[PDB]
Amino acid sequence: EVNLIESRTVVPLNTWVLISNFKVAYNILRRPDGTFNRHLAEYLDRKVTANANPVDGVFSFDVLIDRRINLLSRVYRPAYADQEQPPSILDLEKPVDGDIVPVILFFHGGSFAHSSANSAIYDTLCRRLVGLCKCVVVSVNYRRAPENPYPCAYDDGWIALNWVNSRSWLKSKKDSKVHIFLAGDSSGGNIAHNVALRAGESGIDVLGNILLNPMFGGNERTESEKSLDGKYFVTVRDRDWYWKAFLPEGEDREHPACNPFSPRGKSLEGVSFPKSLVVVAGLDLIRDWQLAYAEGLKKAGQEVKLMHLEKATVGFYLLPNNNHFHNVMDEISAFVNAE
Amino acid sequence: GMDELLAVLGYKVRSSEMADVAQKLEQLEVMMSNVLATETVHYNPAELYTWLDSMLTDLN
Ligand SMILES: C=C1C[C@]23C[C@H]1CC[C@H]2[C@@]12CC[C@H](O)[C@@](C)(C(=O)O1)[C@H]2[C@@H]3C(=O)O
DSSP: OOOOHHHHTSSOHHHHHHHHHHHHHHHHHBOTTSOBOHHHHHHHSOBOOOOSSOBTTEEEEEEEEETTTTEEEEEEEEOOTTOSSOOOTTSTTOOOOSSOOEEEEEEOOSTTTSOOTTBHHHHHHHHHHHHHHTSEEEEEOOOOTTTSOTTHHHHHHHHHHHHHHTOGGGOBTTTTBOEEEEEEETHHHHHHHHHHHHHHTTTOOEEEEEEESOOOOOSSOOHHHHHHTTTSSOOHHHHHHHHHHHSOTTOOTTSTTTOTTSTTSOOOTTOOOOEEEEEEETTOTTHHHHHHHHHHHHHTTOOEEEEEETTOOTTGGGSSOSHHHHHHHHHHHHHHHOO | OBOHHHHTTTOOOBGGGHHHHHHHHHHHHHHHTTOOOTTGGGSOTTOHHHHHHHHHHHOO
């Protein structure tokens, strides 16, 4: 039955290897009974430390934002101009210089159960964002399911948002305010949406949200789910598994955390919500849910720019070897730097 | 010649062996669809070629 020739036709071979490797490894980590092999997961994941030394124009450092839960976030900044020596542990929080300095609060993907801020795929993505958008990036190492299910991820994002917004050294000179943009791929995009909702209800002004192949769902089986099931790295079976691991016991996929436009979700009509850049991979099996999300925002009168990449698959933004990556990075920069 | 785009992501794969690694991934999916992980922790996860080869053996 197994035949992966079809998926190889739409992506570069090395990309196919990277995503397929995660696919097979994750098959092992997820157990039929709902448990997760966390020890093996963290052993297999490829990680990297922070580095105060600028590499390719970017340096980074980790910060403990909440001890009770050991919540870490990695800060990525462009190399300091005219620095004669590398940053010491006392030079990491030097005030940003610039009339307007965008700060992207990023949430990695992994369907709520996989990866960390220090996972190589995400450390690389964040470093690329710093260089391509000429901004500061703060990547949240939010807690993962099933051990720390809903609402842990959202709570961690909220804590990180307040931390970022309260950093005097991240204030832009123009208006003495931290210009915050929420961003995330997969489950990270979902977290960004929900953190934004909470921000608008607390007075914290988020300037924009960037969702890459955001993870949303619902009780219904969309046409894209039925037609693309297992064809491009993802199966409905594993989607169901991650939702069950993240959502409260006894809940279904119409819970607002899964379906932001569920009858149970609060209306966004007449609500102060940031402008959004929604990127949808055409070959992502949950494409229909993502398109429905973008339409939901538009229908609620929210500002939304939709990028529907017809032949893109999940993970297209992990390697700079395709036009989806280039096109998207161009729009992200324009989005965060727009007036 | 190693693939530098994968190397930055933590994986060591020779560009000339990319197709072979791709083949092994599929062969492993095949076995999994016909099916442990205790021995997995002993293998080097960065070396995809050998990692997959070792896993293929553990199965079968
Ligand atoms: C079970 C999963 C989890 C996938 C889909 C499928 C196989 C490949 C995984 C990752 C692995 C790498 C990236 O984090 C990701 C964002 C990506 O692009 O591929 C993942 C995606 C997800 O969480 O939505």
